[PDB]
Structures are given as structure tokens and as C-alpha cells.
mmCIF file with all atom_site columns, C-alpha atoms in Angstrom:
data_model
loop_
_atom_site.group_PDB
_atom_site.id
_atom_site.type_symbol
_atom_site.label_atom_id
_atom_site.label_alt_id
_atom_site.label_comp_id
_atom_site.label_asym_id
_atom_site.label_entity_id
_atom_site.label_seq_id
_atom_site.pdbx_PDB_ins_code
_atom_site.Cartn_x
_atom_site.Cartn_y
_atom_site.Cartn_z
_atom_site.occupancy
_atom_site.B_iso_or_equiv
_atom_site.pdbx_formal_charge
_atom_site.auth_seq_id
_atom_site.auth_comp_id
_atom_site.auth_asym_id
_atom_site.auth_atom_id
_atom_site.pdbx_PDB_model_num
ATOM 1   C CA . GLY A 1 1  ? -29.453 141.406 56.196 1.00 43.71 ? 1  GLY A CA 1
ATOM 2   C CA . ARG A 1 2  ? -28.072 143.278 59.207 1.00 46.34 ? 2  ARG A CA 1
ATOM 3   C CA . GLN A 1 3  ? -28.902 146.832 60.304 1.00 44.05 ? 3  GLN A CA 1
ATOM 4   C CA . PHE A 1 4  ? -27.138 149.592 62.034 1.00 43.35 ? 4  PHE A CA 1
ATOM 5   C CA . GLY A 1 5  ? -28.276 149.315 65.639 1.00 42.90 ? 5  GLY A CA 1
ATOM 6   C CA . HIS A 1 6  ? -27.964 145.473 65.787 1.00 42.39 ? 6  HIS A CA 1
ATOM 7   C CA . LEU A 1 7  ? -24.395 144.801 64.610 1.00 45.20 ? 7  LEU A CA 1
ATOM 8   C CA . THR A 1 8  ? -22.315 144.359 67.724 1.00 43.08 ? 8  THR A CA 1
ATOM 9   C CA . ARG A 1 9  ? -21.489 145.761 71.233 1.00 44.42 ? 9  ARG A CA 1
ATOM 10  C CA . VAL A 1 10 ? -18.955 148.620 71.526 1.00 43.39 ? 10 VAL A CA 1
ATOM 11  C CA . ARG A 1 11 ? -18.016 150.415 74.735 1.00 43.46 ? 11 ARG A CA 1
ATOM 12  C CA . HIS A 1 12 ? -15.808 153.409 75.412 1.00 42.28 ? 12 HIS A CA 1
ATOM 13  C CA . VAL A 1 13 ? -14.685 154.781 72.094 1.00 42.19 ? 13 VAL A CA 1
ATOM 14  C CA . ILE A 1 14 ? -14.916 158.341 71.036 1.00 40.60 ? 14 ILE A CA 1
ATOM 15  C CA . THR A 1 15 ? -14.828 159.392 67.407 1.00 41.52 ? 15 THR A CA 1
ATOM 16  C CA . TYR A 1 16 ? -14.105 162.988 66.515 1.00 40.99 ? 16 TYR A CA 1
ATOM 17  C CA . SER A 1 17 ? -14.845 164.152 62.980 1.00 42.03 ? 17 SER A CA 1
ATOM 18  C CA . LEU A 1 18 ? -15.070 167.167 60.689 1.00 41.50 ? 18 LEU A CA 1
ATOM 19  C CA . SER A 1 19 ? -17.547 168.381 58.101 1.00 34.60 ? 19 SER A CA 1
ATOM 20  C CA . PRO A 1 20 ? -16.334 167.935 54.531 1.00 33.94 ? 20 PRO A CA 1
ATOM 21  C CA . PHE A 1 21 ? -17.012 171.629 53.875 1.00 35.80 ? 21 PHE A CA 1
ATOM 22  C CA . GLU A 1 22 ? -14.526 172.363 56.674 1.00 31.79 ? 22 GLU A CA 1
ATOM 23  C CA . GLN A 1 23 ? -11.528 170.313 55.510 1.00 28.24 ? 23 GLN A CA 1
ATOM 24  C CA . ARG A 1 24 ? -9.407  169.758 52.374 1.00 27.40 ? 24 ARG A CA 1
ATOM 25  C CA . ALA A 1 25 ? -10.055 166.869 50.052 1.00 31.70 ? 25 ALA A CA 1
ATOM 26  C CA . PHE A 1 26 ? -6.338  166.500 49.147 1.00 31.48 ? 26 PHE A CA 1
ATOM 27  C CA . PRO A 1 27 ? -4.302  167.977 52.081 1.00 34.03 ? 27 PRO A CA 1
ATOM 28  C CA . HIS A 1 28 ? -0.745  166.759 51.525 1.00 32.98 ? 28 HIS A CA 1
ATOM 29  C CA . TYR A 1 29 ? -1.496  164.755 48.439 1.00 31.35 ? 29 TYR A CA 1
ATOM 30  C CA . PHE A 1 30 ? 2.132   164.595 47.345 1.00 29.69 ? 30 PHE A CA 1
ATOM 31  C CA . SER A 1 31 ? 3.996   165.545 50.550 1.00 28.77 ? 31 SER A CA 1
ATOM 32  C CA . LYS A 1 32 ? 2.594   162.488 52.397 1.00 28.25 ? 32 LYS A CA 1
ATOM 33  C CA . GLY A 1 33 ? 1.224   160.275 49.606 1.00 25.66 ? 33 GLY A CA 1
ATOM 34  C CA . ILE A 1 34 ? 4.390   159.640 47.596 1.00 26.51 ? 34 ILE A CA 1
ATOM 35  C CA . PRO A 1 35 ? 6.282   158.469 50.762 1.00 25.55 ? 35 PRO A CA 1
ATOM 36  C CA . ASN A 1 36 ? 3.305   156.307 51.540 1.00 26.86 ? 36 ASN A CA 1
ATOM 37  C CA . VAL A 1 37 ? 3.293   154.567 48.202 1.00 27.23 ? 37 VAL A CA 1
ATOM 38  C CA . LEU A 1 38 ? 7.043   154.061 48.311 1.00 28.93 ? 38 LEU A CA 1
ATOM 39  C CA . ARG A 1 39 ? 6.468   152.403 51.719 1.00 29.30 ? 39 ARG A CA 1
ATOM 40  C CA . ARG A 1 40 ? 3.634   150.080 50.532 1.00 29.13 ? 40 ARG A CA 1
ATOM 41  C CA . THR A 1 41 ? 5.710   149.216 47.558 1.00 32.64 ? 41 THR A CA 1
ATOM 42  C CA . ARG A 1 42 ? 8.691   148.172 49.773 1.00 31.16 ? 42 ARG A CA 1
ATOM 43  C CA . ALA A 1 43 ? 6.347   146.196 51.981 1.00 29.73 ? 43 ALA A CA 1
ATOM 44  C CA . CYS A 1 44 ? 5.136   144.058 49.130 1.00 30.35 ? 44 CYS A CA 1
ATOM 45  C CA . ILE A 1 45 ? 7.812   143.810 46.383 1.00 28.89 ? 45 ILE A CA 1
ATOM 46  C CA . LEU A 1 46 ? 9.465   140.741 47.840 1.00 30.17 ? 46 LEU A CA 1
ATOM 47  C CA . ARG A 1 47 ? 6.222   138.805 47.682 1.00 25.34 ? 47 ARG A CA 1
ATOM 48  C CA . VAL A 1 48 ? 4.689   140.188 44.443 1.00 23.43 ? 48 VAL A CA 1
ATOM 49  C CA . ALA A 1 49 ? 7.686   140.806 42.089 1.00 24.90 ? 49 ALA A CA 1
ATOM 50  C CA . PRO A 1 50 ? 9.776   137.551 42.141 1.00 27.38 ? 50 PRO A CA 1
ATOM 51  C CA . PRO A 1 51 ? 7.258   135.087 40.544 1.00 28.33 ? 51 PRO A CA 1
ATOM 52  C CA . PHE A 1 52 ? 6.848   137.603 37.735 1.00 28.97 ? 52 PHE A CA 1
ATOM 53  C CA . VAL A 1 53 ? 10.581  138.002 36.942 1.00 31.35 ? 53 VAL A CA 1
ATOM 54  C CA . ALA A 1 54 ? 10.615  134.175 37.049 1.00 32.24 ? 54 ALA A CA 1
ATOM 55  C CA . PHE A 1 55 ? 7.905   134.198 34.342 1.00 29.08 ? 55 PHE A CA 1
ATOM 56  C CA . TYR A 1 56 ? 9.724   137.021 32.544 1.00 27.17 ? 56 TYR A CA 1
ATOM 57  C CA . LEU A 1 57 ? 12.986  134.958 32.410 1.00 26.54 ? 57 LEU A CA 1
ATOM 58  C CA . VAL A 1 58 ? 11.127  131.887 31.101 1.00 28.61 ? 58 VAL A CA 1
ATOM 59  C CA . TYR A 1 59 ? 9.295   134.130 28.624 1.00 30.55 ? 59 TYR A CA 1
ATOM 60  C CA . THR A 1 60 ? 12.429  135.452 26.916 1.00 32.97 ? 60 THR A CA 1
ATOM 61  C CA . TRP A 1 61 ? 14.340  132.156 27.085 1.00 30.58 ? 61 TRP A CA 1
ATOM 62  C CA . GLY A 1 62 ? 11.340  130.161 25.839 1.00 29.09 ? 62 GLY A CA 1
ATOM 63  C CA . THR A 1 63 ? 10.864  132.305 22.755 1.00 25.51 ? 63 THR A CA 1
ATOM 64  C CA . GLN A 1 64 ? 14.608  132.404 22.192 1.00 21.73 ? 64 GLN A CA 1
ATOM 65  C CA . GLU A 1 65 ? 14.830  128.671 22.038 1.00 21.44 ? 65 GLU A CA 1
ATOM 66  C CA . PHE A 1 66 ? 11.817  128.554 19.762 1.00 19.91 ? 66 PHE A CA 1
ATOM 67  C CA . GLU A 1 67 ? 13.353  130.779 17.107 1.00 19.83 ? 67 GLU A CA 1
ATOM 68  C CA . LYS A 1 68 ? 16.885  129.355 17.173 1.00 20.92 ? 68 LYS A CA 1
ATOM 69  C CA . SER A 1 69 ? 15.691  125.762 17.337 1.00 22.62 ? 69 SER A CA 1
ATOM 70  C CA . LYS A 1 70 ? 13.285  125.620 14.420 1.00 23.21 ? 70 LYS A CA 1
ATOM 71  C CA . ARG A 1 71 ? 13.626  128.456 11.954 1.00 24.40 ? 71 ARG A CA 1
ATOM 72  C CA . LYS A 1 72 ? 17.022  130.099 12.257 1.00 25.19 ? 72 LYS A CA 1
ATOM 73  C CA . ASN A 1 73 ? 18.412  126.664 12.596 1.00 26.14 ? 73 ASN A CA 1
ATOM 74  C CA . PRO A 1 74 ? 18.940  124.559 9.526  1.00 24.91 ? 74 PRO A CA 1
ATOM 75  C CA . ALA A 1 75 ? 22.364  124.045 11.017 1.00 25.90 ? 75 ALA A CA 1
ATOM 76  C CA . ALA A 1 76 ? 24.862  121.719 9.258  1.00 28.46 ? 76 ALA A CA 1
ATOM 77  C CA . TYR A 1 77 ? 23.829  119.099 6.633  1.00 31.16 ? 77 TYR A CA 1
ATOM 78  C CA . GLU A 1 78 ? 27.359  118.965 5.213  1.00 30.15 ? 78 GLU A CA 1
ATOM 79  C CA . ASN A 1 79 ? 28.497  117.062 2.119  1.00 32.07 ? 79 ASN A CA 1
ATOM 80  C CA . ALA B 2 1  ? -38.101 184.587 64.853 1.00 31.94 ? 1  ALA B CA 1
ATOM 81  C CA . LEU B 2 2  ? -35.773 181.681 65.698 1.00 31.66 ? 2  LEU B CA 1
ATOM 82  C CA . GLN B 2 3  ? -37.483 181.162 69.019 1.00 33.29 ? 3  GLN B CA 1
ATOM 83  C CA . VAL B 2 4  ? -40.910 181.384 67.323 1.00 36.22 ? 4  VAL B CA 1
ATOM 84  C CA . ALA B 2 5  ? -39.759 178.616 64.978 1.00 38.82 ? 5  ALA B CA 1
ATOM 85  C CA . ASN B 2 6  ? -38.421 176.636 67.946 1.00 37.07 ? 6  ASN B CA 1
ATOM 86  C CA . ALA B 2 7  ? -41.748 176.951 69.771 1.00 36.20 ? 7  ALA B CA 1
ATOM 87  C CA . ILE B 2 8  ? -43.537 175.495 66.641 1.00 35.08 ? 8  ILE B CA 1
ATOM 88  C CA . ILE B 2 9  ? -41.241 172.452 66.851 1.00 36.08 ? 9  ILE B CA 1
ATOM 89  C CA . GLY B 2 10 ? -41.656 172.484 70.650 1.00 37.40 ? 10 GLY B CA 1
ATOM 90  C CA . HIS B 2 11 ? -40.342 169.866 73.068 1.00 37.26 ? 11 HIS B CA 1
ATOM 91  C CA . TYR B 2 12 ? -41.691 166.538 74.226 1.00 35.77 ? 12 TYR B CA 1
ATOM 92  C CA . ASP B 2 13 ? -41.512 164.181 77.083 1.00 37.81 ? 13 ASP B CA 1
ATOM 93  C CA . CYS B 2 14 ? -43.064 160.796 77.560 1.00 41.89 ? 14 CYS B CA 1
ATOM 94  C CA . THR B 2 15 ? -45.142 162.107 80.476 1.00 42.49 ? 15 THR B CA 1
ATOM 95  C CA . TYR B 2 16 ? -47.089 164.593 78.302 1.00 45.42 ? 16 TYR B CA 1
ATOM 96  C CA . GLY B 2 17 ? -50.800 164.140 78.232 1.00 48.28 ? 17 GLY B CA 1
ATOM 97  C CA . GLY B 2 18 ? -52.082 163.635 74.720 1.00 49.04 ? 18 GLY B CA 1
ATOM 98  C CA . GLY B 2 19 ? -49.445 162.663 72.208 1.00 48.85 ? 19 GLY B CA 1
ATOM 99  C CA . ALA B 2 20 ? -51.059 161.831 68.893 1.00 50.84 ? 20 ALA B CA 1
ATOM 100 C CA . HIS B 2 21 ? -52.963 165.164 68.956 1.00 50.69 ? 21 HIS B CA 1
ATOM 101 C CA . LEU B 2 22 ? -50.065 167.442 69.730 1.00 51.46 ? 22 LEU B CA 1
ATOM 102 C CA . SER B 2 23 ? -49.654 170.405 67.308 1.00 49.45 ? 23 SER B CA 1
ATOM 103 C CA . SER B 2 24 ? -45.914 169.916 66.645 1.00 48.92 ? 24 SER B CA 1
ATOM 104 C CA . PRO B 2 25 ? -45.558 167.231 63.926 1.00 49.90 ? 25 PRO B CA 1
ATOM 105 C CA . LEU B 2 26 ? -42.258 166.169 65.477 1.00 50.89 ? 26 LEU B CA 1
ATOM 106 C CA . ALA B 2 27 ? -43.934 165.845 68.831 1.00 51.73 ? 27 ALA B CA 1
ATOM 107 C CA . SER B 2 28 ? -46.960 164.031 67.632 1.00 51.37 ? 28 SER B CA 1
ATOM 108 C CA . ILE B 2 29 ? -45.104 161.614 65.322 1.00 49.46 ? 29 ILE B CA 1
ATOM 109 C CA . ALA B 2 30 ? -42.632 160.942 68.125 1.00 50.26 ? 30 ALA B CA 1
ATOM 110 C CA . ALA B 2 31 ? -45.412 160.169 70.522 1.00 49.87 ? 31 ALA B CA 1
ATOM 111 C CA . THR B 2 32 ? -47.288 157.873 68.122 1.00 46.44 ? 32 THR B CA 1
ATOM 112 C CA . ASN B 2 33 ? -44.293 155.957 66.925 1.00 43.74 ? 33 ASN B CA 1
ATOM 113 C CA . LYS B 2 34 ? -42.363 155.940 70.217 1.00 42.96 ? 34 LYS B CA 1
ATOM 114 C CA . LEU B 2 35 ? -39.293 157.482 68.602 1.00 46.93 ? 35 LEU B CA 1
ATOM 115 C CA . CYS B 2 36 ? -38.326 159.351 71.599 1.00 44.87 ? 36 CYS B CA 1
ATOM 116 C CA . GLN B 2 37 ? -38.395 159.551 75.324 1.00 45.56 ? 37 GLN B CA 1
ATOM 117 C CA . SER B 2 38 ? -37.852 163.259 75.247 1.00 45.89 ? 38 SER B CA 1
ATOM 118 C CA . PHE B 2 39 ? -36.556 166.015 73.041 1.00 44.99 ? 39 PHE B CA 1
ATOM 119 C CA . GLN B 2 40 ? -36.289 169.804 73.194 1.00 42.75 ? 40 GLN B CA 1
ATOM 120 C CA . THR B 2 41 ? -35.298 172.629 70.931 1.00 42.96 ? 41 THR B CA 1
ATOM 121 C CA . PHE B 2 42 ? -32.928 175.291 72.010 1.00 45.44 ? 42 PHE B CA 1
ATOM 122 C CA . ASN B 2 43 ? -31.285 178.543 71.239 1.00 44.34 ? 43 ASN B CA 1
ATOM 123 C CA . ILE B 2 44 ? -28.178 179.094 73.316 1.00 44.72 ? 44 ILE B CA 1
ATOM 124 C CA . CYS B 2 45 ? -26.849 182.586 72.839 1.00 42.38 ? 45 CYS B CA 1
ATOM 125 C CA . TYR B 2 46 ? -23.420 183.849 73.462 1.00 46.34 ? 46 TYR B CA 1
ATOM 126 C CA . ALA B 2 47 ? -21.772 186.992 72.295 1.00 47.89 ? 47 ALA B CA 1
ATOM 127 C CA . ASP B 2 48 ? -21.874 186.981 68.479 1.00 45.89 ? 48 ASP B CA 1
ATOM 128 C CA . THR B 2 49 ? -22.392 183.264 68.280 1.00 44.67 ? 49 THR B CA 1
ATOM 129 C CA . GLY B 2 50 ? -24.632 180.594 69.608 1.00 46.73 ? 50 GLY B CA 1
ATOM 130 C CA . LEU B 2 51 ? -26.040 177.127 69.383 1.00 47.11 ? 51 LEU B CA 1
ATOM 131 C CA . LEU B 2 52 ? -29.370 176.683 67.726 1.00 47.69 ? 52 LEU B CA 1
ATOM 132 C CA . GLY B 2 53 ? -30.897 173.261 67.446 1.00 48.59 ? 53 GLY B CA 1
ATOM 133 C CA . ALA B 2 54 ? -32.383 170.438 69.435 1.00 48.50 ? 54 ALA B CA 1
ATOM 134 C CA . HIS B 2 55 ? -31.354 167.628 71.863 1.00 48.86 ? 55 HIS B CA 1
ATOM 135 C CA . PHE B 2 56 ? -33.189 164.281 72.201 1.00 49.29 ? 56 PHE B CA 1
ATOM 136 C CA . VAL B 2 57 ? -33.134 161.014 74.184 1.00 51.00 ? 57 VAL B CA 1
ATOM 137 C CA . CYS B 2 58 ? -34.039 157.683 72.741 1.00 49.07 ? 58 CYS B CA 1
ATOM 138 C CA . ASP B 2 59 ? -33.780 153.949 72.281 1.00 47.90 ? 59 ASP B CA 1
ATOM 139 C CA . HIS B 2 60 ? -30.944 152.511 70.184 1.00 45.82 ? 60 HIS B CA 1
ATOM 140 C CA . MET B 2 61 ? -33.141 151.650 67.186 1.00 45.28 ? 61 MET B CA 1
ATOM 141 C CA . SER B 2 62 ? -34.838 155.073 66.907 1.00 45.10 ? 62 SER B CA 1
ATOM 142 C CA . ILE B 2 63 ? -32.006 157.529 66.414 1.00 44.25 ? 63 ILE B CA 1
ATOM 143 C CA . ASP B 2 64 ? -32.260 157.344 62.726 1.00 42.88 ? 64 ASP B CA 1
ATOM 144 C CA . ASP B 2 65 ? -35.983 158.046 62.680 1.00 42.15 ? 65 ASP B CA 1
ATOM 145 C CA . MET B 2 66 ? -35.702 160.817 65.278 1.00 40.84 ? 66 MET B CA 1
ATOM 146 C CA . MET B 2 67 ? -33.082 162.604 63.108 1.00 40.44 ? 67 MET B CA 1
ATOM 147 C CA . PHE B 2 68 ? -35.055 162.151 59.913 1.00 40.30 ? 68 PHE B CA 1
ATOM 148 C CA . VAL B 2 69 ? -38.109 163.799 61.498 1.00 40.68 ? 69 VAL B CA 1
ATOM 149 C CA . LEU B 2 70 ? -36.244 166.496 63.411 1.00 40.36 ? 70 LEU B CA 1
ATOM 150 C CA . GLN B 2 71 ? -34.467 167.519 60.172 1.00 39.34 ? 71 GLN B CA 1
ATOM 151 C CA . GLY B 2 72 ? -37.675 167.298 58.102 1.00 35.72 ? 72 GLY B CA 1
ATOM 152 C CA . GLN B 2 73 ? -39.185 169.936 60.385 1.00 37.11 ? 73 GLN B CA 1
ATOM 153 C CA . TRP B 2 74 ? -36.324 172.422 60.047 1.00 38.12 ? 74 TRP B CA 1
ATOM 154 C CA . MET B 2 75 ? -36.443 172.011 56.242 1.00 35.59 ? 75 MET B CA 1
ATOM 155 C CA . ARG B 2 76 ? -40.211 172.374 56.223 1.00 37.27 ? 76 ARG B CA 1
ATOM 156 C CA . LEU B 2 77 ? -40.041 175.615 58.160 1.00 37.14 ? 77 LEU B CA 1
ATOM 157 C CA . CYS B 2 78 ? -37.191 176.937 56.004 1.00 37.49 ? 78 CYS B CA 1
ATOM 158 C CA . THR B 2 79 ? -39.121 176.595 52.793 1.00 37.65 ? 79 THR B CA 1
ATOM 159 C CA . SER B 2 80 ? -42.767 175.912 53.656 1.00 38.45 ? 80 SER B CA 1
ATOM 160 C CA . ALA B 2 81 ? -43.991 177.476 56.981 1.00 35.75 ? 81 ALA B CA 1
ATOM 161 C CA . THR B 2 82 ? -47.717 178.295 57.085 1.00 36.41 ? 82 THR B CA 1
ATOM 162 C CA . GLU B 2 83 ? -49.427 181.148 58.894 1.00 38.52 ? 83 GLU B CA 1
ATOM 163 C CA . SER B 2 84 ? -51.395 179.522 61.693 1.00 37.35 ? 84 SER B CA 1
ATOM 164 C CA . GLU B 2 85 ? -48.447 177.575 62.962 1.00 36.00 ? 85 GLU B CA 1
ATOM 165 C CA . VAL B 2 86 ? -46.474 180.799 63.235 1.00 38.14 ? 86 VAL B CA 1
ATOM 166 C CA . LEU B 2 87 ? -49.327 182.282 65.250 1.00 36.88 ? 87 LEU B CA 1
ATOM 167 C CA . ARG B 2 88 ? -49.207 179.300 67.617 1.00 40.68 ? 88 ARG B CA 1
ATOM 168 C CA . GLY B 2 89 ? -45.417 179.635 67.867 1.00 41.72 ? 89 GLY B CA 1
#
């Protein structure tokens, strides 16, 4: 495996950080989170959602044809 | 008392004569395992506040060991200090 100390070369970056006992674990959970999820949702709906409505449409049609075609059917046999 | 504790831990530098035999466990382990090039404890005092700890200098693959040992010594003193070491301190 690989160990801290031998990963890669980094120069010039400062990282400032706080102790957990000094900060909140949920700061603006709703205030900032909700907006954030709305935003990630917008960013991906166009790629995720369409194939699924496409399946959805074929799902309802497909079963619809199945019922009307076979069972419900016995349409005309008139004499 | 804090300074007495700090003396127990001591300081170390790679030009110190005798390393393996040094009283301070930090100091002696650091000398035997080359974890360090130097280190020192400190008690900076300001009005009503201060900085109490240690600073050290070392190679890139020894920071983790230096911290483990430095921290083991504070813990050890917190809960387990013996009498003769306090006398030396």
C-alpha cells in the first residue's frame, strides 16, 4: 500500500482548521442545505430523470395493452 | 508544577552527548530511533493565558512517531507520574 509521507509533492498550501469541540456539527443545516439540494437536483435532473419517465411510459402502456388485448378482449364473434 | 513536568520531558538536540541513556523517555527514544533532530518543551505565559506544550523538528517520515511519543509522555504524567522523576524535574 501507500503511506502518508510518500504520496506526492505539495508546495505552498495552507490549511486552517478548527477543533470539533469548538464548532457546530449542523450549523445551517436547513438554511444552507435545502438550497444546496435543490441546486444538485437541478444540476442532474436532465440526465437522470428522462430515461426513467421513458420506462414509466412503457410500463403503463405495456400493461395496458396486456390487459385489453388478452383478457378484457373477447371482442366480437358475431352471429 | 507545569515547569517541573516540562523539565521531566526536557528538550533534545542531535548534538547531545549520550542519547540512549537520557532520563527523559521522549529524549531517549527520540535519540535511539532518530525521530527527531531537536525538540523542546515550553511554557509561554501571558496575562491570564499562555501556551504550554512542545515544538520539534524532524524528517518527513517521523512526524507521526514524534507526536505519538510526545503525547504519550503528557498522558503518562497526567495519570502516572512517579516520585523520582519529579525530583529530577
